[PDB]
Design a binder for this molecule. Structure first.
Ligand SMILES: CCCCCCCCCCCCC/C=C/[C@H](O)[C@H](N)CO
Ligand SMILES: CCCCCCCCCCCCC/C=C/[C@H](O)[C@H](N)CO
Ligand SMILES: CCCCCCCCCCCCCC(=O)O
Ligand SMILES: CCCCCCCCCCCCCC(=O)O
Ligand SMILES: CCCCCCCCCCCCCC(=O)O
Lengths: 238, 251, 274, 57, 238, 274, 57, 57
């Protein structure tokens, strides 16, 4: 018949090929597709959804509901930090188990800008102002509000609108960062400091609670699928 | 704007501090088309007698409380004529509208997460066993979460940070959700369409979705203030229709 | 092109009443704030894409779903063949990827990787021809073979593939063979209408069995073989995304678990070091 | 039969050929180049369209 | 020659492929096709034919002709059922061995609406009325005619036309049901009750006989071929 | 599209003289009553089809028809090769599928699956080259080989296929090779005109024989082999459908049986439980 | 030679190509897409056409 | 799909055919026939163009 020649790579099983195969049951009649609501076309539609960030994960708070809550208090204030964590959305104790960081662990590279939304869950008579800073990784982490005001920071006035989005920009020298980061592709730190402080009227609870959210912007991207280092097994499940 | 009003049947619901209306995964509840239907016989369609607001039982948000859940449509078994069509018809299909309301004060504080979890399969507390139906959903009261680990042999694992399913409780925000912040919000309304893999299903052996209310930021106040902050749930079916009329079972 | 990401439009200073950062999460709304609302940005032409993060590029990778062993010995005829009620719950790496979505509808390629060895003991073979394996799929309700060399291995209607050792792995395609309109990964309900029976997805799994055997007697010694089944879902549509799982799996028919911590611990709440 | 389509290349002879050999639609190769998306169903599942610059409440 | 590459699935024997093969005896001259009457184009032309249903299969009646006959009688009546069986056309003692249920056991899934035709084989002077009910599987099976009148039922007046077709609708939540059914895809029950009763003149036989038939409608479908669990062997037949 | 099923047109209440339920089976007529005549139905667009239930999709699946063993030993030259008078009656799974129709006319693909082993005993092989098999088809009346290494294995006109072990199974196509115009599965008659001889289909089966052997001597030891023949009828036309069989088969040349019960027993006539 | 025909897909690039390589009609692939039927020969084998709504006798 | 290009022969039926079978640009064969060059960046990396016949200094 026709003279061919078998190249290298024949009779192998590559797990991610796109080949045709003969059907086991031919002329099969499939049930018609009904319009089920909530169709996922892309995995970035899930990572663009805000989810609560366990920033208070100091044991013993990971076996309770207190991991998601941030303590703020009364007098006097402002020589104390509110919270602080590195910017590592795929490899961190803080937010690798969130909705953004779970899909990030299925990939090796990531890129884009990350949002952080902060809800103030105190009473409706409590005032306050905070400084929400982000720092590029060139230098040492800040230790007070004089070193933290030089980076990218917004000032959040708590009022009738009880949320503020600190949008971390994408500042790096590479187009992509690793998910399992290192000293090369480090992204920096995210800190929070008291601007003025909580002023409550008499008869109000003196201490409140801030919740943290994290999601992706519209220029987020992932690349290089891999398996997650999150779930394991030893033998087959019966 | 902060004022809304939802009128269904012979019942209205008025609110004055509303966040918005979350509408499912985008779509509105509707009737089953002729393109997708598989039941041959004529379906019944009670407009006013079935699709109206039903007020469930009231719970108490204590300062040490951790969460509750209701499974639907099993929670409306003895609610009016909606529960009488479920017994007489083998098939059912409906969307819902879940209004959850909890007003406290300008001096109270707290937060809640009101999710609607489709096909919320729940895990037992004694592994290598199975739950029973009396431990999944009560007749009208709420099944609550526990702060510690559940020790029972045939109950749901009602620990709160695993949400009774094995997942992270912070990652429940994929589902249609609102937040009752007592600083800014008073009520939370969620319109859920009919989410299933089949076009219709028997609504006795299949809980379509589970409503969960979980306090992330707990409730605190001062001794001058009130010490009873209740939550009330009001659920209306929407575009409900049924097939397969036989004898009532049960009963 | 398709499907690229949005560019950051350039931004100068501002003093407006239209503040885009202040929002309200209580409405259940994720904000659309791009970095140009909170700081001055520059015009970059972002050429990145989201082709690697689609549904079809995420799930079209083959994963193992079973490991089955069988003999060619004499005596104990249950060891002369292997069985598998068809699941996607026994191996965890594909179970966790499916369970991010509630419903799934796809086609599939199924690859069989069979790898044998020679069993020890006296009276070995020392000269054997190649082995050949028959991998019969039984749709739900068919005649189950009690052992090898049975009448049910004729398979006039059951699809069977015969495969000699030394060639490429066997591979066929399977359509969307469910009864409903989506493979329900989760089923919050029962099997009987009296709210009794089997709670969970194990009542919805009616896909049939898979049987594999040696079609050759040999007549001298024993050679074990290990069938590894691989599943690649293609033409995938998915609905209602779920949170990924936190606690490790225990059973292949349950979502039962033991309550695990939400994350790993760290030293302080303000722990930017080191 | 010759469905000439474009290959995958990065933006700063790019066409390939594909034949369907078998008589079943499940026998085809994967639909790896369908890149639609609609994230508004989970990000903005509201009844009223919300503007960024306008206040929410 | 031409450079190829062998994909996985080479040199295998799939029993249901559609491949070309070289002819053993080439240029063979085949006898011409003659018009034999009774050509089968589809297997649903056989399952659409009525066949007698052994509803009286209580041993000892399966080793006789009495399995196909239904007893009806005289006085008084109507606190008794005529017959009753589950709706399971592929897996039942009643009608898996009929013409409809034999072709159903070659397939795994089935769908559509099933007909039941009832011939009254009593004398031409005997009157009577019956209730032929079908019940969806949501609740308990009926125990009398007050619970059986709520389902899908017809009323059959025995007269000059001695047959009545009770047409069971296709009511389920899935597009297909399994042939080997279970608690999930159960279809319900089919009962029969006396409406009024038999009134015969003097000199007539007091008891009669009803025959049951079963066939498919024009919207019946089967899917997923498999082997029947109906015939077996041990060794080769000599 | 083709070949879909009928839709149920919508129906309201009625009070007519045209009753479609009341009919008469005495005419030998199956009724055309759709559910819209006895109850109120709704307009559904039924998208199901009957592609999986046609004649060609029902019979175009390969089934085993014979299992033949042969040696490579010394002595007893009847064991050095295998024979088969060509039948579709020896394996039951294809015999029952054919016997739903009286007549059949089709083409065929024939696949040979040969699987060997090493025979035990002293003086084993320990280094053997691959085996090669010759599978000769003898049309009715040809020279039958008395043993292996015979003159009749030349096959200048008999079609023979040579196949080394380790490759894909051998496969060829065969046209409609009958004398008449349809393969008669049933033949109610005799062979002689005096109503004597062979009653049944065994007189009409004149298709020839099949012989299989090893073309290699080996010269050290014995290796048995098992030929399995597979039949896939394609381009199928069928006539006069029969009832499916009830009692199990006994002989390969008869419809003889033992009288079996019509169904399986149940407890009562009204046995809707459980 | 290129007999471009349609694949099998379910109603809510669907074409395939097929060449006949051998010189015999029995060498071809199976006629899996001939979906004719005529059930009137066994369901209604009457001399007179019977109407449903009209009575039989 | 048939990208007919010329073979490699020495200056004193020279065409070949090439199909792209796979859906990725990294799957292609090597670009062995792109023979551009620009040696002025390393040989003459000057700000002013230098003439051979004119003196440098
Ligand atoms: C020897 C020939 C073997 C033929 C191979 C076909 C057997 C496999 C058929 C079943 C595979 C369909 C995909 C199944 C997926 C899971 O069941 C769903 N995720 C659960 O509903
Ligand atoms: C070594 C080369 C082998 C060539 C294989 C051809 C041998 C087989 C020819 C006969 C097969 C034709 C199909 C026979 C069907 C049954 O005889 C009929 N159902 C009975 O009349
Ligand atoms: C069974 C597939 C054989 C290969 C297909 C025939 C060879 C390529 C023909 C290209 C033109 C086909 C018509 C268009 O499409
Ligand atoms: C012996 C078969 C070789 C393969 C067939 C030639 C290559 C495909 C040619 C396609 C156009 C053929 C003419 C038409 O049909
Ligand atoms: C998957 C690749 C199959 C081989 C490509 C089809 C056969 C050659 C077709 C030649 C004409 C293609 C259209 C141009 O280019």
């Amino acid at each position: 018949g026709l003279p061919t020649m078998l190249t290298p790579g024949s009779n192998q099983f590559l797990t991610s090929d796109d080949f045709q195969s003969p059907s086991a049951m031919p002329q099969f009649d499939v049930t018609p597709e009904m319009k089920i609501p909530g169709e996922v076309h892309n995995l970035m539609e899930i990572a663009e959804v805000d989810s609560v960030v366990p920033v208070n994960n100091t044991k013993e708070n990971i076996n309770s509901m207190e991991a998601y809550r941030i303590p703020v208090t009364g007098g006097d204030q402002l020589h104390t930090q509110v919270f602080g964590f590195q910017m590592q959305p795929g490899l961190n104790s803080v937010f690798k188990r969130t909705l953004l960081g779970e899909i990030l662990n299925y990939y090796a590279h990531w890129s884009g800008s990350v949002k952080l939304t902060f809800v103030f869950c105190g009473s409706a008579m409590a005032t306050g102002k905070f400084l929400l800073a982000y720092s590029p990784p060139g230098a040492s982490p800040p230790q007070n509000r004089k070193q933290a005001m030089l980076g990218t920071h917004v000032i959040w006035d708590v009022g009738l609108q009880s949320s503020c989005v600190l949008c971390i920009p994408w500042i790096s020298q590479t187009h992509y960062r690793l998910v399992q980061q290192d000293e090369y592709t480090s992204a920096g730190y995210v800190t929070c400091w008291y601007q003025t402080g909580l002023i409550v009227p008499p008869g109000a609870p003196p201490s409140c609670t801030i919740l943290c959210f994290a999601s992706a912007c519209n220029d987020f991207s992932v690349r290089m699928l891999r398996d997650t280092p999150f779930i394991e097994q030893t033998q087959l499940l019966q | 704007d902060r004022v809304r009003s939802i009128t269904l049947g012979n019942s209205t619901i008025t609110t004055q501090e509303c966040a918005n209306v979350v509408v499912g995964y985008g779509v509105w509840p509707s009737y089953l088309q002729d393109n997708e239907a598989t039941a041959e016989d004529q379906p019944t369609q009670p407009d006013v007698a079935t699709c109206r607001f039903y007020t469930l039982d009231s719970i108490q948000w204590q300062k040490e409380s951790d969460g509750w859940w209701w499974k639907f449509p099993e929670a409306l078994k003895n609610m009016g004529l909606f529960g009488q069509n479920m017994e007489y018809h083998y098939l059912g299909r409906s969307g819902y509208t879940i209004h959850v309301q909890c007003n406290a004060s300008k001096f109270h504080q707290g937060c809640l997460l009101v999710v609607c979890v489709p096909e919320a399969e729940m895990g037992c507390s004694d592994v290598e066993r199975e739950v029973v139906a009396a431990s999944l959903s009560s007749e009208d009261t709420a099944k609550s979460f526990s702060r510690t680990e559940s020790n029972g042999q045939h109950t749901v694992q009602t620990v709160v940070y695993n949400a009774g399913m094995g997942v992270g409780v912070g990652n429940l925000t994929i589902f249609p959700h609102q937040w009752i912040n007592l600083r800014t919000n008073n009520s939370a309304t969620i319109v859920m369409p009919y989410i299933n893999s089949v076009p219709m299903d028997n609504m006795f052996r299949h809980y379509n979705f589970t409503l969960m209310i979980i306090p992330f930021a707990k409730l605190e106040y001062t001794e001058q203030a009130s010490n009873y902050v209740p939550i009330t749930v009001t659920v209306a079916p929407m575009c409900a229709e049924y097939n397969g009329l036989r004898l009532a079972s049960h009963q | 092109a398709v499907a690229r990401v949005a560019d950051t439009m350039p931004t100068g200073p501002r003093n407006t009443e239209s503040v885009p950062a202040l929002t309200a999460v209580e409405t259940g709304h994720t904000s659309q704030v791009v970095p140009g609302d909170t700081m001055q940005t520059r015009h970059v032409k972002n050429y990145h894409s989201r082709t690697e993060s689609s549904i079809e590029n995420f799930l079209c990778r083959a994963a193992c779903v079973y490991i089955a062993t069988y003999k060619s010995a004499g005596g104990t005829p249950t060891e002369r063949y292997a069985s598998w009620r068809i699941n996607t719950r026994q191996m965890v790496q594909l179970r966790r990827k499916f369970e991010l979505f509630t419903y799934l509808r796809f086609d599939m390629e199924i690859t069989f990787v069979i790898t044998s060895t020679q069993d020890p003991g006296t009276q070995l073979a020392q000269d054997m021809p190649v082995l050949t394996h028959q991998i019969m799929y039984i749709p739900p309700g068919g005649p189950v073979p009690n052992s090898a060399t049975d009448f049910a291995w004729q398979s006039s209607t059951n699809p069977s593939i015969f495969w000699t050792e030394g060639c490429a792995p066997a591979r066929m395609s399977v359509p969307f063979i469910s009864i409903g309109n989506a493979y329900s990964n989760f089923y919050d309900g029962w099997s009987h209408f009296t709210q009794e029976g089997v709670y969970g997805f194990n009542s919805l799994n009616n896909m049939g069995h898979i049987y594999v055997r040696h079609v050759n007697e040999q007549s001298l010694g024993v050679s074990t073989s290990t069938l590894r089944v691989y599943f690649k879902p293609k033409h995938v549509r998915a609905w209602v995304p779920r949170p990924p799982r936190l606690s490790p799996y225990v059973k292949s028919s349950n979502v039962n678990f033991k309550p695990t911590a939400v994350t790993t611990e760290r030293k302080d709440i303000n722990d930017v070091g080191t | 039969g010759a469905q000439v389509s474009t290959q995958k290349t990065g933006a700063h002879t790019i066409h390939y050929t594909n034949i369907n050999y078998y008589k079943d639609a499940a026998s085809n190769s994967a639909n790896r180049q369908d890149f639609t998306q609609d994230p508004s169903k989970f990000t903005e599942p509201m009844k009223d369209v919300m503007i960024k610059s306008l206040p929410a409440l």
